[PDB]
């Protein structure tokens, strides 16, 4: 994800000495993970059944 | 022939009840918080009103 960012002012006299300047996008990062494994047993005993 | 008018007020009948600017400068979690990366608002709550 990726946010929004502050307002500058405006300001022609320091302008002059960081036209270069950096300024970061501050984005985020969320992680997910497999967490659910099982299974389901049963049994038949068909000769016994009968 | 030119006539000009000397210390004149901008707020000359303006009745303020409260100063929206110092109540934004002093808001820590108030209502007030929604002005606060708004950054000339110090040149707009000035002449905003005519």
Redesign the interface.
């Given at each position: 994800y990726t946010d929004i960012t502050?307002?500058?002012?405006y300001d022609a006299e320091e302008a002059e000495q960081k036209v270069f300047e950096r300024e970061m996008p501050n984005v985020k990062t969320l992680f997910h993970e497999r967490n659910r494994q099982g299974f389901y047993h049963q049994t038949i005993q068909d000769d016994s059944l009968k | 022939m030119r006539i000009t008018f000397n210390d004149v007020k901008t707020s000359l009948g303006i009745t303020e009840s409260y100063d929206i600017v110092n109540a934004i400068r002093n808001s820590q979690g108030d209502n007030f918080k929604s002005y606060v990366?708004?950054?000339?608002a110090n040149n707009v709550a000035e002449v905003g009103a005519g």
């Open positions: 502050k307002e500058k002012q | 990366p708004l950054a000339t």
